[PDB]
Protein backbone atom coordinates (compact mmCIF):
# COMPACT_ATOMS: atom_id res chain seq x y z
CA UNK A 1 0.00 0.00 0.00
CA UNK A 2 1.69 3.18 1.22
CA UNK A 3 4.60 3.38 3.65
CA UNK A 4 6.50 6.64 4.08
CA UNK A 5 8.73 7.57 7.01
CA UNK A 6 7.91 10.88 8.81
CA UNK A 7 9.99 13.87 7.69
CA UNK A 8 11.42 13.89 11.22
CA UNK A 9 13.50 10.78 10.48
CA UNK A 10 14.66 12.00 7.05
CA UNK A 11 17.43 14.44 6.16
CA UNK A 12 15.72 17.76 5.17
CA UNK A 13 18.66 18.65 2.90
CA UNK A 14 18.66 15.42 0.85
CA UNK A 15 15.08 14.35 1.56
CA UNK A 16 16.42 10.81 1.97
CA UNK A 17 16.58 8.24 4.76
CA UNK A 18 20.07 7.97 6.25
CA UNK A 19 21.80 6.88 9.46
CA UNK A 20 23.82 9.92 10.53
CA UNK A 21 21.71 12.54 12.39
CA UNK A 22 23.40 15.69 13.68
CA UNK A 23 22.14 19.05 14.95
CA UNK A 24 23.13 22.62 14.16
CA UNK A 25 23.40 25.44 16.69
CA UNK A 26 19.96 26.66 15.59
CA UNK A 27 18.63 23.22 16.55
CA UNK A 28 18.07 22.14 12.93
CA UNK A 29 18.74 18.50 12.02
CA UNK A 30 20.82 17.61 8.97
CA UNK A 31 22.98 14.78 7.67
CA UNK A 32 26.53 14.81 9.06
CA UNK A 33 28.00 14.08 5.63
CA UNK A 34 26.35 17.13 4.08
CA UNK A 35 27.51 19.36 6.93
CA UNK A 36 31.06 18.12 6.66
CA UNK A 37 31.01 19.12 3.01
CA UNK A 38 29.40 22.42 3.96
CA UNK A 39 32.08 23.27 6.50
CA UNK A 40 34.83 21.86 4.32
CA UNK A 41 33.58 24.06 1.50
CA UNK A 42 34.40 26.95 3.85
CA UNK A 43 30.77 28.03 4.11
CA UNK A 44 29.95 29.78 7.39
CA UNK A 45 26.28 30.43 6.69
CA UNK A 46 23.01 28.54 7.11
CA UNK A 47 21.99 27.02 3.69
CA UNK A 48 18.34 27.03 4.76
CA UNK A 49 17.99 30.83 5.01
CA UNK A 50 21.42 32.01 3.82
CA UNK A 51 21.84 33.65 7.22
CA UNK A 52 25.35 34.07 8.71
CA UNK A 53 26.67 31.59 11.28
CA UNK A 54 29.11 32.58 14.02
CA UNK A 55 29.12 29.18 15.75
CA UNK A 56 28.94 25.50 14.82
CA UNK A 57 28.47 22.30 16.81
CA UNK A 58 28.97 18.57 16.31
CA UNK A 59 26.32 17.57 18.83
CA UNK A 60 24.92 14.13 17.75
CA UNK A 61 21.21 13.32 17.87
CA UNK A 62 19.92 11.50 20.95
CA UNK A 63 16.12 11.33 21.27
CA UNK A 64 15.84 11.14 17.49
CA UNK A 65 17.87 7.93 17.49
CA UNK A 66 15.74 6.40 20.24
CA UNK A 67 12.55 7.36 18.43
CA UNK A 68 13.68 5.93 15.08
CA UNK A 69 14.63 2.66 16.77
CA UNK A 70 11.13 2.35 18.22
CA UNK A 71 9.65 3.31 14.86
CA UNK A 72 11.45 0.48 13.08
CA UNK A 73 10.40 -2.00 15.76
CA UNK A 74 6.77 -0.97 15.38
CA UNK A 75 7.00 -1.65 11.67
CA UNK A 76 9.07 -4.74 12.47
CA UNK A 77 11.66 -3.78 9.88
CA UNK A 78 15.33 -2.80 9.74
CA UNK A 79 16.98 0.36 8.41
CA UNK A 80 17.87 0.07 4.65
CA UNK B 1 -6.87 6.43 25.10
CA UNK B 2 -3.35 6.41 26.53
CA UNK B 3 -2.80 8.64 29.57
CA UNK B 4 0.97 8.01 29.54
CA UNK B 5 3.33 9.63 27.05
CA UNK B 6 6.69 8.09 25.97
CA UNK B 7 9.68 8.83 28.19
CA UNK B 8 11.32 10.45 25.16
CA UNK B 9 8.90 13.38 25.35
CA UNK B 10 9.01 13.36 29.15
CA UNK B 11 11.74 15.45 30.75
CA UNK B 12 14.45 13.00 32.04
CA UNK B 13 15.28 15.24 35.02
CA UNK B 14 11.75 15.46 36.50
CA UNK B 15 10.01 12.72 34.50
CA UNK B 16 7.26 15.32 34.15
CA UNK B 17 5.27 16.37 31.08
CA UNK B 18 6.55 19.65 29.65
CA UNK B 19 7.06 21.41 26.33
CA UNK B 20 10.38 23.24 26.32
CA UNK B 21 13.35 20.82 25.81
CA UNK B 22 16.91 21.98 25.18
CA UNK B 23 20.14 20.07 24.47
CA UNK B 24 23.49 19.96 26.23
CA UNK B 25 26.99 19.67 24.74
CA UNK B 26 26.99 16.08 26.01
CA UNK B 27 23.96 15.30 23.80
CA UNK B 28 21.65 15.26 26.80
CA UNK B 29 18.16 16.76 26.71
CA UNK B 30 16.88 18.69 29.72
CA UNK B 31 13.93 20.97 30.44
CA UNK B 32 14.66 24.67 29.98
CA UNK B 33 13.37 25.64 33.43
CA UNK B 34 15.65 23.19 35.25
CA UNK B 35 18.78 24.28 33.39
CA UNK B 36 17.92 27.90 34.11
CA UNK B 37 17.93 27.17 37.84
CA UNK B 38 21.23 25.36 37.40
CA UNK B 39 22.78 28.39 35.73
CA UNK B 40 21.33 30.72 38.35
CA UNK B 41 22.87 28.56 41.04
CA UNK B 42 26.21 29.09 39.29
CA UNK B 43 26.77 25.33 39.14
CA UNK B 44 29.63 24.04 36.98
CA UNK B 45 28.93 20.30 36.96
CA UNK B 46 26.51 17.93 35.23
CA UNK B 47 23.68 17.04 37.73
CA UNK B 48 23.43 13.40 36.57
CA UNK B 49 27.15 12.53 36.67
CA UNK B 50 28.29 15.22 39.10
CA UNK B 51 31.21 15.83 36.75
CA UNK B 52 32.72 19.30 35.95
CA UNK B 53 31.47 20.99 32.79
CA UNK B 54 34.18 22.92 30.96
CA UNK B 55 31.53 24.24 28.57
CA UNK B 56 27.80 24.27 27.84
CA UNK B 57 25.56 24.67 24.80
CA UNK B 58 22.00 25.97 24.57
CA UNK B 59 19.83 24.72 21.72
CA UNK B 60 15.97 25.14 21.61
CA UNK B 61 13.70 22.19 20.82
CA UNK B 62 13.33 20.96 17.24
CA UNK B 63 11.86 17.67 15.91
CA UNK B 64 10.21 17.17 19.29
CA UNK B 65 7.70 19.90 18.45
CA UNK B 66 6.43 18.09 15.35
CA UNK B 67 6.24 14.75 17.17
CA UNK B 68 4.37 16.27 20.10
CA UNK B 69 1.68 17.75 17.85
CA UNK B 70 1.28 14.51 15.89
CA UNK B 71 1.19 12.47 19.09
CA UNK B 72 -1.66 14.53 20.52
CA UNK B 73 -3.57 14.31 17.24
CA UNK B 74 -3.21 10.52 17.15
CA UNK B 75 -4.62 10.23 20.65
CA UNK B 76 -7.06 13.08 20.02
CA UNK B 77 -5.96 14.62 23.32
CA UNK B 78 -5.16 18.22 24.22
CA UNK B 79 -1.59 18.99 25.28
CA UNK B 80 -1.53 20.49 28.85
Coordinates of N, CA, C and O in Angstrom, one line a residue:
Chain A
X1 N 0.9 -1.2 0.0 CA 0.0 0.0 0.0 C 0.9 1.2 0.0 O 1.6 1.5 -1.0
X2 N 0.9 2.0 1.1 CA 1.7 3.2 1.2 C 2.5 3.2 2.5 O 1.9 3.0 3.6
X3 N 3.8 3.4 2.5 CA 4.6 3.4 3.6 C 5.7 4.4 3.5 O 6.7 4.2 2.8
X4 N 5.5 5.6 4.1 CA 6.5 6.6 4.1 C 6.9 7.1 5.5 O 6.1 7.3 6.3
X5 N 8.2 7.2 5.7 CA 8.7 7.6 7.0 C 8.4 9.0 7.3 O 8.5 9.9 6.3
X6 N 8.1 9.4 8.5 CA 7.9 10.9 8.8 C 9.1 11.7 8.4 O 10.3 11.2 8.4
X7 N 8.9 13.0 8.1 CA 10.0 13.9 7.7 C 11.0 14.0 8.8 O 12.2 14.4 8.6
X8 N 10.6 13.8 10.0 CA 11.4 13.9 11.2 C 12.6 12.9 11.1 O 13.7 13.2 11.6
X9 N 12.4 11.8 10.5 CA 13.5 10.8 10.5 C 14.2 10.8 9.1 O 15.0 9.9 8.8
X10 N 14.0 11.9 8.3 CA 14.7 12.0 7.0 C 15.5 13.3 7.0 O 15.1 14.3 7.6
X11 N 16.6 13.3 6.3 CA 17.4 14.4 6.2 C 16.7 15.5 5.4 O 16.4 15.3 4.2
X12 N 16.4 16.7 5.9 CA 15.7 17.8 5.2 C 16.5 18.2 3.9 O 15.9 18.5 2.9
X13 N 17.8 18.2 4.0 CA 18.7 18.7 2.9 C 18.6 17.7 1.7 O 18.5 18.1 0.6
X14 N 18.7 16.4 1.9 CA 18.7 15.4 0.8 C 17.3 14.7 0.7 O 17.1 14.0 -0.2
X15 N 16.4 15.0 1.6 CA 15.1 14.3 1.6 C 15.2 12.8 1.4 O 14.5 12.2 0.6
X16 N 16.2 12.2 2.1 CA 16.4 10.8 2.0 C 16.7 10.2 3.3 O 17.3 10.8 4.2
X17 N 16.3 8.9 3.5 CA 16.6 8.2 4.8 C 18.1 7.9 4.9 O 18.7 7.3 4.0
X18 N 18.7 8.2 6.0 CA 20.1 8.0 6.3 C 20.4 7.8 7.7 O 19.6 8.3 8.6
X19 N 21.4 7.1 8.1 CA 21.8 6.9 9.5 C 23.0 7.7 9.8 O 24.1 7.2 9.9
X20 N 22.8 9.0 10.1 CA 23.8 9.9 10.5 C 23.2 11.3 10.9 O 23.5 12.3 10.3
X21 N 22.4 11.3 11.9 CA 21.7 12.5 12.4 C 22.6 13.4 13.3 O 23.1 13.0 14.3
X22 N 22.7 14.7 12.9 CA 23.4 15.7 13.7 C 22.6 17.0 13.8 O 21.6 17.2 13.0
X23 N 22.9 17.8 14.8 CA 22.1 19.1 14.9 C 23.0 20.3 14.9 O 24.2 20.3 15.3
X24 N 22.4 21.3 14.3 CA 23.1 22.6 14.2 C 22.8 23.5 15.4 O 22.0 23.1 16.2
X25 N 23.6 24.6 15.5 CA 23.4 25.4 16.7 C 22.0 25.9 16.8 O 21.4 26.1 17.9
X26 N 21.3 26.2 15.6 CA 20.0 26.7 15.6 C 19.0 25.6 16.0 O 17.8 25.8 16.3
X27 N 19.5 24.3 16.1 CA 18.6 23.2 16.5 C 18.1 22.4 15.3 O 17.3 21.5 15.5
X28 N 18.5 22.8 14.1 CA 18.1 22.1 12.9 C 18.8 20.8 12.8 O 19.9 20.7 13.2
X29 N 18.1 19.8 12.2 CA 18.7 18.5 12.0 C 19.1 18.3 10.6 O 18.3 18.5 9.7
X30 N 20.3 17.9 10.3 CA 20.8 17.6 9.0 C 21.8 16.4 9.0 O 22.3 16.0 10.0
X31 N 22.1 15.9 7.8 CA 23.0 14.8 7.7 C 24.4 15.3 8.0 O 24.8 16.3 7.5
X32 N 25.2 14.4 8.7 CA 26.5 14.8 9.1 C 27.4 15.0 7.8 O 28.2 15.8 7.7
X33 N 27.2 14.1 6.8 CA 28.0 14.1 5.6 C 27.8 15.4 4.9 O 28.8 16.0 4.5
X34 N 26.6 15.9 4.8 CA 26.3 17.1 4.1 C 27.0 18.3 4.8 O 27.7 19.2 4.2
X35 N 26.9 18.3 6.1 CA 27.5 19.4 6.9 C 29.0 19.4 6.8 O 29.6 20.4 6.7
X36 N 29.6 18.2 6.8 CA 31.1 18.1 6.7 C 31.5 18.8 5.4 O 32.5 19.5 5.3
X37 N 30.7 18.5 4.3 CA 31.0 19.1 3.0 C 30.8 20.6 3.1 O 31.5 21.4 2.5
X38 N 29.7 21.0 3.8 CA 29.4 22.4 4.0 C 30.5 23.2 4.7 O 31.0 24.2 4.2
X39 N 31.0 22.6 5.8 CA 32.1 23.3 6.5 C 33.4 23.2 5.7 O 34.1 24.2 5.6
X40 N 33.6 22.1 5.1 CA 34.8 21.9 4.3 C 34.9 22.9 3.2 O 35.9 23.4 2.8
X41 N 33.7 23.1 2.6 CA 33.6 24.1 1.5 C 34.0 25.5 2.0 O 34.2 26.3 1.2
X42 N 34.0 25.7 3.3 CA 34.4 26.9 3.8 C 33.2 27.8 4.0 O 33.3 29.1 4.2
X43 N 32.0 27.3 4.0 CA 30.8 28.0 4.1 C 30.4 28.2 5.6 O 30.3 27.2 6.3
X44 N 30.3 29.5 6.0 CA 30.0 29.8 7.4 C 28.6 30.4 7.5 O 28.3 31.3 8.3
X45 N 27.6 29.9 6.7 CA 26.3 30.4 6.7 C 25.3 29.3 6.7 O 25.6 28.2 6.3
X46 N 24.0 29.6 7.1 CA 23.0 28.5 7.1 C 22.4 28.4 5.7 O 21.8 29.3 5.2
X47 N 22.6 27.2 5.1 CA 22.0 27.0 3.7 C 20.5 27.2 3.6 O 19.9 27.6 2.6
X48 N 19.8 26.9 4.7 CA 18.3 27.0 4.8 C 17.8 28.5 4.5 O 16.9 28.7 3.7
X49 N 18.4 29.4 5.2 CA 18.0 30.8 5.0 C 19.1 31.8 4.6 O 18.9 33.0 4.5
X50 N 20.3 31.2 4.3 CA 21.4 32.0 3.8 C 21.8 33.0 4.9 O 22.5 34.0 4.6
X51 N 21.5 32.8 6.1 CA 21.8 33.7 7.2 C 23.3 33.3 7.7 O 23.7 32.2 7.5
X52 N 24.0 34.3 8.2 CA 25.4 34.1 8.7 C 25.4 33.2 10.0 O 24.5 33.3 10.8
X53 N 26.5 32.4 10.1 CA 26.7 31.6 11.3 C 28.0 31.9 12.0 O 29.1 31.9 11.3
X54 N 27.9 32.2 13.3 CA 29.1 32.6 14.0 C 29.5 31.4 14.9 O 30.5 31.5 15.6
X55 N 28.8 30.3 14.9 CA 29.1 29.2 15.7 C 28.6 27.9 15.2 O 27.5 27.8 14.6
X56 N 29.3 26.8 15.3 CA 28.9 25.5 14.8 C 29.1 24.5 15.9 O 29.8 24.7 16.9
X57 N 28.4 23.3 15.8 CA 28.5 22.3 16.8 C 28.3 20.9 16.2 O 27.6 20.7 15.2
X58 N 29.0 19.9 16.8 CA 29.0 18.6 16.3 C 28.2 17.7 17.3 O 28.4 16.5 17.4
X59 N 27.2 18.3 17.9 CA 26.3 17.6 18.8 C 25.5 16.5 18.1 O 24.7 16.8 17.2
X60 N 25.7 15.2 18.4 CA 24.9 14.1 17.7 C 23.5 14.0 18.3 O 23.2 14.4 19.4
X61 N 22.6 13.5 17.5 CA 21.2 13.3 17.9 C 21.1 12.3 19.0 O 21.9 11.3 19.0
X62 N 20.1 12.4 19.8 CA 19.9 11.5 21.0 C 18.5 10.9 21.0 O 18.3 9.7 20.8
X63 N 17.5 11.8 21.2 CA 16.1 11.3 21.3 C 15.7 10.9 19.9 O 14.8 10.0 19.8
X64 N 16.2 11.5 18.9 CA 15.8 11.1 17.5 C 16.2 9.7 17.2 O 15.4 8.9 16.7
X65 N 17.4 9.3 17.7 CA 17.9 7.9 17.5 C 16.9 6.9 18.2 O 16.6 5.9 17.7
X66 N 16.6 7.3 19.4 CA 15.7 6.4 20.2 C 14.4 6.3 19.6 O 13.8 5.2 19.5
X67 N 13.8 7.4 19.1 CA 12.5 7.4 18.4 C 12.5 6.5 17.1 O 11.6 5.8 16.9
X68 N 13.6 6.7 16.3 CA 13.7 5.9 15.1 C 13.8 4.4 15.3 O 13.2 3.6 14.6
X69 N 14.5 4.1 16.4 CA 14.6 2.7 16.8 C 13.3 2.1 17.1 O 12.9 1.0 16.6
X70 N 12.5 2.8 17.9 CA 11.1 2.4 18.2 C 10.3 2.3 17.0 O 9.4 1.4 16.8
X71 N 10.4 3.2 16.1 CA 9.6 3.3 14.9 C 9.9 2.1 14.0 O 8.9 1.5 13.5
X72 N 11.1 1.7 13.9 CA 11.4 0.5 13.1 C 10.9 -0.8 13.7 O 10.3 -1.6 13.0
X73 N 10.9 -0.8 15.0 CA 10.4 -2.0 15.8 C 8.9 -2.1 15.6 O 8.4 -3.2 15.4
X74 N 8.2 -1.0 15.6 CA 6.8 -1.0 15.4 C 6.4 -1.6 14.0 O 5.6 -2.4 13.9
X75 N 7.2 -1.1 13.0 CA 7.0 -1.7 11.7 C 7.6 -3.1 11.6 O 7.2 -3.8 10.7
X76 N 8.5 -3.4 12.5 CA 9.1 -4.7 12.5 C 10.1 -4.9 11.3 O 10.2 -6.0 10.8
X77 N 10.7 -3.8 11.0 CA 11.7 -3.8 9.9 C 13.0 -3.2 10.3 O 13.1 -2.6 11.4
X78 N 14.0 -3.3 9.4 CA 15.3 -2.8 9.7 C 15.7 -1.6 8.8 O 15.1 -1.5 7.7
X79 N 16.6 -0.8 9.2 CA 17.0 0.4 8.4 C 17.6 -0.1 7.1 O 18.5 -1.0 7.1
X80 N 17.3 0.5 6.0 CA 17.9 0.1 4.7 C 19.4 0.1 4.7 O 20.0 -0.7 4.0
Chain B
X1 N -8.0 5.5 25.4 CA -6.9 6.4 25.1 C -5.7 6.2 26.1 O -5.9 5.6 27.1
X2 N -4.5 6.6 25.7 CA -3.4 6.4 26.5 C -3.1 7.7 27.4 O -2.9 8.8 26.8
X3 N -3.0 7.5 28.7 CA -2.8 8.6 29.6 C -1.3 8.8 29.9 O -0.9 9.7 30.6
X4 N -0.5 7.9 29.3 CA 1.0 8.0 29.5 C 1.7 8.2 28.2 O 1.6 7.5 27.3
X5 N 2.5 9.3 28.2 CA 3.3 9.6 27.1 C 4.7 9.0 27.1 O 5.2 8.7 28.2
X6 N 5.3 8.7 26.0 CA 6.7 8.1 26.0 C 7.7 8.9 26.8 O 7.6 10.1 26.9
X7 N 8.7 8.2 27.4 CA 9.7 8.8 28.2 C 10.5 9.8 27.3 O 11.1 10.7 27.9
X8 N 10.5 9.6 26.0 CA 11.3 10.5 25.2 C 10.8 11.9 25.3 O 11.6 12.8 25.3
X9 N 9.5 12.0 25.3 CA 8.9 13.4 25.3 C 9.0 13.9 26.8 O 9.1 15.1 27.0
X10 N 8.9 13.0 27.7 CA 9.0 13.4 29.1 C 10.4 13.9 29.5 O 11.4 13.4 29.0
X11 N 10.5 14.9 30.4 CA 11.7 15.5 30.7 C 12.5 14.4 31.6 O 12.0 14.0 32.6
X12 N 13.7 14.0 31.2 CA 14.5 13.0 32.0 C 14.7 13.4 33.5 O 14.7 12.6 34.4
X13 N 15.0 14.7 33.7 CA 15.3 15.2 35.0 C 14.1 15.1 36.0 O 14.3 14.7 37.1
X14 N 12.9 15.5 35.6 CA 11.8 15.5 36.5 C 10.7 14.4 36.1 O 9.7 14.2 36.8
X15 N 11.0 13.7 35.0 CA 10.0 12.7 34.5 C 8.6 13.3 34.5 O 7.6 12.6 34.7
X16 N 8.5 14.6 34.2 CA 7.3 15.3 34.1 C 7.0 15.8 32.7 O 7.9 16.1 32.0
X17 N 5.7 15.9 32.4 CA 5.3 16.4 31.1 C 5.5 17.9 30.9 O 5.1 18.7 31.8
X18 N 6.2 18.2 29.9 CA 6.5 19.6 29.6 C 6.8 19.9 28.2 O 7.1 18.9 27.4
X19 N 6.8 21.1 27.7 CA 7.1 21.4 26.3 C 8.0 22.6 26.2 O 7.7 23.7 26.0
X20 N 9.3 22.3 26.4 CA 10.4 23.2 26.3 C 11.8 22.6 26.5 O 12.5 23.0 27.3
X21 N 12.0 21.5 25.7 CA 13.4 20.8 25.8 C 14.5 21.5 25.1 O 14.4 22.1 24.1
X22 N 15.7 21.4 25.7 CA 16.9 22.0 25.2 C 18.0 20.9 25.3 O 17.9 20.0 26.0
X23 N 19.1 21.1 24.5 CA 20.1 20.1 24.5 C 21.4 20.6 25.2 O 21.5 21.8 25.4
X24 N 22.2 19.6 25.5 CA 23.5 20.0 26.2 C 24.6 19.5 25.3 O 24.5 18.7 24.4
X25 N 25.8 20.0 25.6 CA 27.0 19.7 24.7 C 27.3 18.2 24.8 O 27.9 17.6 23.9
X26 N 26.8 17.5 25.9 CA 27.0 16.1 26.0 C 25.9 15.3 25.3 O 25.9 14.0 25.3
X27 N 25.0 16.0 24.6 CA 24.0 15.3 23.8 C 22.8 14.9 24.7 O 22.0 14.0 24.4
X28 N 22.7 15.6 25.9 CA 21.6 15.3 26.8 C 20.5 16.3 26.7 O 20.8 17.5 26.4
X29 N 19.3 15.8 26.8 CA 18.2 16.8 26.7 C 17.5 17.0 28.1 O 17.2 16.1 28.8
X30 N 17.4 18.3 28.4 CA 16.9 18.7 29.7 C 15.9 19.8 29.6 O 15.9 20.6 28.6
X31 N 14.9 19.9 30.5 CA 13.9 21.0 30.4 C 14.6 22.3 30.6 O 15.6 22.4 31.4
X32 N 14.1 23.3 29.9 CA 14.7 24.7 30.0 C 14.6 25.3 31.4 O 15.6 25.9 31.8
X33 N 13.5 25.1 32.1 CA 13.4 25.6 33.4 C 14.4 25.1 34.4 O 15.0 25.9 35.2
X34 N 14.7 23.8 34.4 CA 15.7 23.2 35.2 C 17.0 23.7 35.0 O 17.8 24.1 35.9
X35 N 17.4 23.8 33.7 CA 18.8 24.3 33.4 C 18.9 25.7 33.8 O 20.0 26.2 34.2
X36 N 17.9 26.5 33.7 CA 17.9 27.9 34.1 C 18.3 28.0 35.6 O 19.1 28.8 36.0
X37 N 17.7 27.2 36.4 CA 17.9 27.2 37.8 C 19.4 26.8 38.1 O 20.1 27.3 39.0
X38 N 19.9 25.8 37.3 CA 21.2 25.4 37.4 C 22.2 26.5 37.1 O 23.2 26.7 37.9
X39 N 21.9 27.3 36.1 CA 22.8 28.4 35.7 C 22.7 29.5 36.8 O 23.7 30.1 37.2
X40 N 21.5 29.7 37.3 CA 21.3 30.7 38.4 C 22.1 30.3 39.6 O 22.7 31.2 40.3
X41 N 22.1 29.0 39.9 CA 22.9 28.6 41.0 C 24.4 28.7 40.8 O 25.1 28.6 41.8
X42 N 24.8 28.9 39.6 CA 26.2 29.1 39.3 C 26.9 27.7 39.3 O 28.1 27.7 39.5
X43 N 26.2 26.7 39.1 CA 26.8 25.3 39.1 C 27.7 25.1 37.9 O 27.4 25.6 36.8
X44 N 28.7 24.3 38.1 CA 29.6 24.0 37.0 C 29.9 22.5 36.8 O 30.9 22.1 36.4
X45 N 28.8 21.8 37.1 CA 28.9 20.3 37.0 C 27.6 19.7 36.5 O 26.5 20.2 36.8
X46 N 27.7 18.6 35.7 CA 26.5 17.9 35.2 C 25.7 17.3 36.4 O 26.3 16.5 37.2
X47 N 24.5 17.6 36.6 CA 23.7 17.0 37.7 C 23.7 15.5 37.8 O 23.8 14.9 38.9
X48 N 23.5 14.9 36.6 CA 23.4 13.4 36.6 C 24.7 12.7 36.9 O 24.7 11.7 37.6
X49 N 25.9 13.2 36.4 CA 27.1 12.5 36.7 C 28.0 13.2 37.7 O 29.0 12.7 38.2
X50 N 27.6 14.4 38.1 CA 28.3 15.2 39.1 C 29.7 15.4 38.6 O 30.7 15.4 39.4
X51 N 29.9 15.6 37.3 CA 31.2 15.8 36.8 C 31.3 17.3 36.3 O 30.4 17.9 35.9
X52 N 32.5 17.9 36.4 CA 32.7 19.3 36.0 C 32.4 19.5 34.5 O 32.6 18.6 33.6
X53 N 31.8 20.7 34.2 CA 31.5 21.0 32.8 C 32.3 22.2 32.3 O 32.1 23.3 32.7
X54 N 33.3 21.9 31.5 CA 34.2 22.9 31.0 C 33.4 23.9 30.0 O 33.9 25.0 29.8
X55 N 32.3 23.4 29.5 CA 31.5 24.2 28.6 C 30.1 23.8 28.5 O 29.8 22.7 29.0
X56 N 29.2 24.6 27.9 CA 27.8 24.3 27.8 C 27.2 24.8 26.6 O 27.7 25.8 26.0
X57 N 26.2 24.2 26.0 CA 25.6 24.7 24.8 C 24.0 24.7 25.0 O 23.4 23.8 25.5
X58 N 23.4 25.8 24.5 CA 22.0 26.0 24.6 C 21.4 25.9 23.2 O 21.6 26.7 22.3
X59 N 20.5 24.9 23.0 CA 19.8 24.7 21.7 C 18.3 24.5 22.0 O 18.0 23.5 22.6
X60 N 17.4 25.3 21.4 CA 16.0 25.1 21.6 C 15.5 23.8 21.0 O 16.2 23.2 20.2
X61 N 14.3 23.4 21.3 CA 13.7 22.2 20.8 C 13.6 22.2 19.3 O 13.8 23.3 18.7
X62 N 13.4 21.0 18.7 CA 13.3 21.0 17.2 C 12.3 19.9 16.8 O 11.1 20.2 16.7
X63 N 12.8 18.7 16.4 CA 11.9 17.7 15.9 C 10.8 17.2 17.0 O 9.8 16.7 16.6
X64 N 11.1 17.5 18.2 CA 10.2 17.2 19.3 C 8.9 17.9 19.1 O 7.8 17.3 19.4
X65 N 8.9 19.1 18.7 CA 7.7 19.9 18.5 C 6.7 19.2 17.5 O 5.5 19.0 17.8
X66 N 7.3 18.8 16.4 CA 6.4 18.1 15.4 C 5.9 16.8 15.9 O 4.7 16.5 15.7
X67 N 6.7 16.0 16.6 CA 6.2 14.8 17.2 C 5.2 15.0 18.2 O 4.2 14.2 18.3
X68 N 5.3 16.0 19.1 CA 4.4 16.3 20.1 C 3.0 16.6 19.5 O 2.0 16.0 20.0
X69 N 3.0 17.4 18.5 CA 1.7 17.7 17.8 C 1.0 16.5 17.2 O -0.2 16.3 17.4
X70 N 1.8 15.7 16.5 CA 1.3 14.5 15.9 C 0.8 13.5 16.9 O -0.2 12.9 16.8
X71 N 1.6 13.4 18.0 CA 1.2 12.5 19.1 C -0.2 12.8 19.7 O -1.0 11.9 19.8
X72 N -0.4 14.1 20.0 CA -1.7 14.5 20.5 C -2.8 14.3 19.5 O -3.9 13.9 19.9
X73 N -2.5 14.5 18.3 CA -3.6 14.3 17.2 C -3.9 12.8 17.1 O -5.1 12.5 17.0
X74 N -2.9 12.0 17.2 CA -3.2 10.5 17.2 C -4.1 10.1 18.3 O -5.0 9.3 18.1
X75 N -3.8 10.6 19.5 CA -4.6 10.2 20.6 C -5.8 11.1 20.8 O -6.7 10.9 21.6
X76 N -5.9 12.2 20.0 CA -7.1 13.1 20.0 C -7.2 13.7 21.4 O -8.3 13.8 22.0
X77 N -6.0 14.0 22.0 CA -6.0 14.6 23.3 C -5.3 16.0 23.3 O -4.3 16.2 22.6
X78 N -5.8 16.9 24.1 CA -5.2 18.2 24.2 C -3.9 18.2 25.0 O -3.7 17.4 26.0
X79 N -2.9 19.0 24.6 CA -1.6 19.0 25.3 C -1.6 20.0 26.4 O -1.7 21.2 26.2
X80 N -1.5 19.6 27.7 CA -1.5 20.5 28.9 C -0.6 21.6 28.7 O -0.8 22.7 29.3

